[PDB]
């Protein structure tokens, strides 16, 4: 199968700038390699064929080179209406196959959560779960770190994570830490704590 | 402009078989040969299944060979892919797609349809259970408060929180989803300021696909 | 009424061949002895084939006797063109034509058909860039502003732009297409009053039958 | 073969009057003379026979007189859809020979005209490449001289031309120079200059 490797899957680009993307086979495709664009919904969209080939309209600031194993594709003008993710595959050999896509997502100046912490509704604990939720949201850049803690220690086990993906209007992304308790050990128990790290700080926020 | 439409999907419990078919509009069917394309989660892209412009090599991929069937139907326009001995390790996204016709035995994939997508397992469907996100009144930052509803165990996919149109501010964020024990569980905030709220109600609407309202705030 | 189409046409990769068949209608097909007469182009027309009403007498070019046989399929019917030995200069439209059965022995076409036009010649097909011309804004000497598209690089031809069926102006200038470096190029210009553009979007819509259809602008 | 032959191609008159048109044949064709009427899109049709046989529906205006080496259409009250390109033929002898044809324009009133002058675009320099296009539209003369500058100076060859064919419903014409550009030699000027001379104006269109 030739193992087709597309190393760096994240790139910040900015806008009116080129990506370079890159590609390399296990063995040597005869420059035959492909670049495919998938966009936030389904949308895969041919891009260019045979190492080369742009397929029709596909607007000319798209272009690729890659001889040998080693490929990559390089936007001119990264416009803000290019950023999905990207996939790099292999017409030569079969199981024809796939780079694995490399997001892409806009940069922007910093920024922090304005975090938030939730308890139990009432329905819940009747139900007999405790999930206390706390979400820091508008920030850039993605990552956000978070901690919980129970009456003075942290809690790790328990806990589960999800972003929003990038926000259209300003780039900035939400998330939620949610430890999932039941209603008895949330009641041995007294402060609950959410506390986070990120780029733009150096207090945890909480 | 040349279209694919897909047409299989379900959720099917590991043993069975399927077929998803597809539906070709756009250009002459006949002079182009298909393939399938799986877009399995967390892990790849997987091309599954080739047949060749009207019939000469219907061409499979080591992995569902022996279960796949890629069978096609010119005068009637539509690709088919019946299934057998489906594993869990096929549930996935399907992508009817077209061949290119460009250039020197190149395989690509000149079109691409919706996707069909087809969960295989056992577990069963199961309702969502909406909760609502609150805080008290005010309290956020300001003078504007964030809230949510917690939507807890569902089975399959899509649940849709929807929230309120009307924007003078009114962000919802959704948290993307995670599995957890065999369930999906996940959140959306939004945010009025401060005059509204507690001032009039606010609500979230939870509907699952299989068939289930919730409503609350 | 005497209606009478052709049917082959094509780029044809210089060599080869085709056949031309002509489908006639509104009299008695056997009266009438048929001719094809063909526009190859900086020339203009050329007669080159005729058969008598029934077939005893065939009369073709210098041009392309030895490679090109008439033939007439009576019933209602037919009429045919199979050409071979295809010298690029054969490049052209093709037409049909009815005789005259008039007077005295002359020679003389009784009515046209519209032609297949037939391209000789390798050149391989492109679609075509569809380059969007544009102003800083505002512009013609003042207001009203001449958006424009630059296709430029096909063949084999036509390309076909639209704009906007949009009465505003709404004049749309197509130039015509000047073939140089084989590929052929164009423009198509149109005014906007500009109380317009880009208040509300243009878009040039560039469509050549081999296929494409690009949008854009 | 004969050879004949139409001296006269494009000839301008007005709407309404005579338009004799003139054909002649290298041998003593023998009234055996035909007049064929090309229409602005495809469309032939007989208009005369035997030199003087007016098919069926053909209009009075159409007469044609001719004999031994020399003959003619003549049109009387020159209408508007009578406006087309005609050739005639000996359908006398192998193989049938017709005369090239006579394009026949709307002699209209003078117009200066409005040249608009686009940059490159973003996606050609993209491409690479660089066309700029020069638009003078809408003009009657025909004739109209054009001429680039690139930082002053004359530019030669770089300039394609092209013109529409009488608009259809003002009897106006219009021009396409491109000069194209390298973007790499594009880069190195900054002046691009189309520039017009036209009969309508003592001075020129910049």
């Known amino acids: 199968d030739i193992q087709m490797t597309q190393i760096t899957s994240s790139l910040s680009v900015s806008l009116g700038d080129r990506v370079i993307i890159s590609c390399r086979a296990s063995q040597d495709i005869g420059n035959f390699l492909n670049w495919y664009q998938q966009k936030p919904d389904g949308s895969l969209k041919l891009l260019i064929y045979y190492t080369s080939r742009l397929q029709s309209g596909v607007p000319s600031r798209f272009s690729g080179w890659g001889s040998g194993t080693d490929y990559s594709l390089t936007i001119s003008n990264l416009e803000e209406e290019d950023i999905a993710t990207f996939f790099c595959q292999q017409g030569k050999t079969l199981p024809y196959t796939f780079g694995g896509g490399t997001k892409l997502e806009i940069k922007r100046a910093d920024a922090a959560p304005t975090v938030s912490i939730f308890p139990p509704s009432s329905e819940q604990l009747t139900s007999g779960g405790a999930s206390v939720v706390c979400f820091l949201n508008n920030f850039y850049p993605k990552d956000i770190n978070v901690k919980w803690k129970i009456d003075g220690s942290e809690r790790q086990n328990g806990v589960l994570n999800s972003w929003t993906d990038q926000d259209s209007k300003d780039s900035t992304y939400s998330m939620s830490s949610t430890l999932t308790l039941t209603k008895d050990e949330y009641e041995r128990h007294n402060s609950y704590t959410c506390e986070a790290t990120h780029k733009t700080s150096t207090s945890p926020i909480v | 402009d040349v279209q694919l439409v897909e047409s299989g999907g379900g959720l099917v419990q590991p043993g069975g078989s399927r077929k998803l078919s597809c539906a070709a509009s756009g250009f002459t069917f006949s002079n182009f040969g298909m393939h399938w394309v799986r877009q399995a989660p967390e892990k790849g892209l997987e091309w599954?299944?080739?047949?060749?412009?009207?019939?000469?090599?219907?061409?499979?991929?080591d992995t569902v060979k022996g279960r796949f069937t890629i069978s096609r139907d010119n005068p009637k326009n539509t690709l088919f892919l019946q299934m057998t001995s489906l594993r869990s390790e096929d549930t996935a996204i399907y992508y009817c797609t077209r061949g290119g016709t460009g250039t020197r035995s190149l395989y690509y994939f000149d079109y691409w349809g919706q996707g069909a997508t087809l969960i295989v397992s056992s577990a069963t469907t199961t309702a969502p259970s909406v909760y609502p996100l609150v805080p008290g009144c005010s309290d956020t930052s300001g003078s504007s408060v964030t809230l949510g509803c917690l939507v807890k165990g569902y089975f399959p996919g899509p649940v849709t929180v929807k929230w309120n149109y009307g924007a003078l501010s009114s962000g919802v964020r959704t948290v993307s989803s995670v599995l957890q024990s065999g369930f999906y569980s996940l959140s959306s905030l939004v945010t009025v300021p401060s005059s509204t709220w507690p001032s009039q109600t606010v609500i979230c609407n939870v509907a699952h696909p299989a068939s289930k309202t919730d409503l609350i705030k | 009424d005497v209606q009478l189409v052709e049917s082959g046409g094509g780029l044809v990769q210089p060599g080869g061949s085709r056949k031309l068949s002509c489908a006639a209608s509104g009299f008695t097909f056997s009266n009438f002895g048929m001719h094809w007469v063909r526009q190859a182009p900086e020339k203009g027309l050329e007669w080159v084939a005729y058969?008598?009403?029934?077939?005893?007498?065939?009369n073709y070019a210098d041009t392309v006797k030895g490679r090109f046989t008439i033939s007439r399929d009576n019933p209602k019917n037919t009429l045919f063109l199979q050409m071979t030995s295809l010298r690029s200069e054969d490049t052209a439209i093709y037409y049909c034509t009815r005789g005259g059965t008039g007077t005295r022995s002359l020679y003389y076409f009784d009515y046209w058909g519209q032609g297949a036009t037939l391209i000789v010649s390798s050149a391989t097909t492109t679609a075509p860039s569809v380059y969007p011309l544009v102003p800083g804004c505002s512009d013609t000497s003042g207001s009203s502003v001449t958006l424009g598209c630059l296709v430029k690089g096909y063949f084999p031809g036509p390309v076909t732009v639209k704009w906007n069926y949009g009465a505003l102006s709404s004049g749309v200038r197509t130039v015509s297409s000047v073939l140089q470096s084989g590929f052929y190029s164009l423009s198509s210009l149109v005014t906007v009053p500009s109380s317009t553009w880009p208040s509300q979007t243009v878009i040039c819509n560039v469509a050549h039958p081999a296929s494409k259809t690009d949008l854009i602008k | 073969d004969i050879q004949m032959t139409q001296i006269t191609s494009s000839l301008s008159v007005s709407l309404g009057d005579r338009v004799i048109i003139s054909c002649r044949a290298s041998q003593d064709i023998g009234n055996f003379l035909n007049w064929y009427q090309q229409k602005p899109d495809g469309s032939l049709k007989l208009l005369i026979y035997y030199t003087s046989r007016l098919q069926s529906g053909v209009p009075s205006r159409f007469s044609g007189w001719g004999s031994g080496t020399d003959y003619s259409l003549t049109i009387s009250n020159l209408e508007e859809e009578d406006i087309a390109t005609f050739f005639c033929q000996q359908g006398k002898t192998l193989p049938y020979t017709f005369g090239g044809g006579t394009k026949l324009e709307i002699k209209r009133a003078d117009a200066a005209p409005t040249v608009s002058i686009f940059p490159p675009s973003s996606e050609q320099l993209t491409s690479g490449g660089a066309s700029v296009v020069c638009f003078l539209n809408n003009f009657y003369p025909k004739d109209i001289n054009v001429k680039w500058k690139i930082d002053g100076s004359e530019r030669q060859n770089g300039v394609l031309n092209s013109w529409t064919d009488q608009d259809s419903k003002d009897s106006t014409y219009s021009m396409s120079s491109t000069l194209t550009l390298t973007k790499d030699e594009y880069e190195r000027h900054n002046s691009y200059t189309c520039e017009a001379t036209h009969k309508t104006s003592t001075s020129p269109i910049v």
């Open positions: 058969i008598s009403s029934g077939g005893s007498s065939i």
